[PDB]
Amino acid sequence: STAGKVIKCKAAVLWEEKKPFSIEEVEVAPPKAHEVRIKMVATGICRTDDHVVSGTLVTPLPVIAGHEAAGIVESIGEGVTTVRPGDKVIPLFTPQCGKCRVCKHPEGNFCLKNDLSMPRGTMQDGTSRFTCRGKPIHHFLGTSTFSQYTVVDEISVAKIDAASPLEKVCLIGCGFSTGYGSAVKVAKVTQGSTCAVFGLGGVGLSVIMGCKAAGAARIIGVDINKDKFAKAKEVGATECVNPQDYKKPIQEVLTEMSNGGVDFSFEVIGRLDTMVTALSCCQEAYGVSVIVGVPPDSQNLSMNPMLLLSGRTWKGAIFGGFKSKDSVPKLVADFMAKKFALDPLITHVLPFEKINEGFDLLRSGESIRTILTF
């Protein structure tokens, strides 16, 4: 009975940077051609959502953020062929249009239809499906999952297993897949290798999971918050180091510990300095460093290109290098077959109405992932 009609529902609207979200009524338009309207079931709080609040990641405001989620299709627009009403789905913050040069490339995943490189905060057609207080509200990464209902382009949604536990598999929509893929797909961690992981939040823990799945012999976790170390060891870290404990720069410490540099390093924080440190700590001739963290808007790092000339490889990726629509359903199926665990990432559960408390938990350092239930 809601098909083709505007839905009034609650969402978490961000009117201004550095302010709490406002939980209030919004109007959600019905889906246009090749659009899908989704009743959200669960959404995670990723640090990237906090970057919108802090102005680390610039996107137009006011906005409905959220990009790590799962829900159930309420209705489909004309021409949709890949999902149906009642299907469980994960919104894809990295689309997979299937048609652009990146989607056609065997190793590309950062589809040209993304809204991350130069955010406009719209649907693919350049418009918004959201109104609040009579004012248009921006989308975020084509997903806008901090709402009881959202509308996404068909290229930004994947159908998943009907028996999936949505309160767990929402993490496949960002943090798990990103970290795990950064290890297994992007870095291609090898059996017996030594890895260093900078940042032990939900994404860095997922990197550790992937490095352990790939057979690394040593996985060194690096965080300035020693409270993060116990869970990092639970999921595979062999040792953890806090840069604040040492007189020398941590790249020197890690080089010493690894008898000349690590095989694979990962920056999973979002700081320019730790991007350079993570590069430096990998072995100069054959090391690989992967940037995963989101940098502060418009800022440049400084580095000595001799770090690369000796043989290092430096790369980054979005969403763990996974082609999103192909990969998300497979990841869910693998989760259902117990090929990896998600519970270690989930430290807190809250109702959606307590979103601000969920952000407080992230900012205090206490949580990994809080899962919000609608």
Ligand X SMILES: NC(=O)c1ccc[n+]([C@@H]2O[C@H](COP(=O)([O-])OP(=O)([O-])OC[C@H]3O[C@@H](n4cnc5c(N)[nH+]cnc54)[C@H](O)[C@@H]3O)[C@@H](O)[C@H]2O)c1
Of 144 and 274, which has the nearer Cβ to a second copy?
274
Positions 87 through 106 that interact with ligand X (CB under 6 A): none
Of 70 and 269, which has the nearer Cβ to a second copy?
269
CA distance 67 to 193: 33
- C-beta separation of 229 from 204 below 8 A: no
- C-beta separation of 62 from 25 below 8 A: no
Buried b / exposed e over 7-17, threshold 16 CB at 10 Å, is bebbbbbbbee
Residue range at the interface with ligand X (CB under 6 A); choices 20-28, 129-137, 194-202, 212-220? 194-202
Closest CB 243 distance from ligand X, rounded Å: 6
Buried b / exposed e over 317-330, threshold 16 CB at 10 Å, is bbbbbbbbbebbbe
SS3 (DSSP) at 312: coil
Q: Does 292 bind ligand X (CB under 6 A)?
A: yes
Binding mask 81-110 for a second copy (x = CB under 8 A): --------------------xx--x-xxxx
Tracing tokens 């627009």 back to the chain, one arrives at: 77
- Residue 184 is which amino acid? V
SS3 (DSSP) at 183: helix
Q: Does 47 bind ligand X (CB under 6 A)?
A: yes
228 touches which of Zn ion, ligand X, a second copy, none (CB within 5 to 8 A by kind)? ligand X
- C-beta separation of 49 from 123 below 8 A: no
312 touches which of ligand X, a second copy, Zn ion, none (CB within 5 to 8 A by kind)? a second copy
Q: Does 67 bind ligand X (CB under 6 A)?
A: no
Binding mask 256-285 for a second copy (x = CB under 8 A): ---xx-----------x--x-------xxx
Of 13 and 275, which has the nearer Cβ to a second copy?
275
* Helix segments in 2-123, DSSP class H: 47-54, 101-104
Of 79 and 86, which has the nearer Cβ to Zn ion?
79
Closest CB 166 distance from a second copy, rounded Å: 28
Q: Does 300 bind a second copy (CB under 8 A)?
A: yes
- C-beta separation of 236 from 219 below 8 A: yes
Residues that bind ligand X (CB under 6 A): 46-48, 51, 174-175, 178, 198-204, 222-225, 228, 243, 268-271, 274, 292-294, 309, 318-319
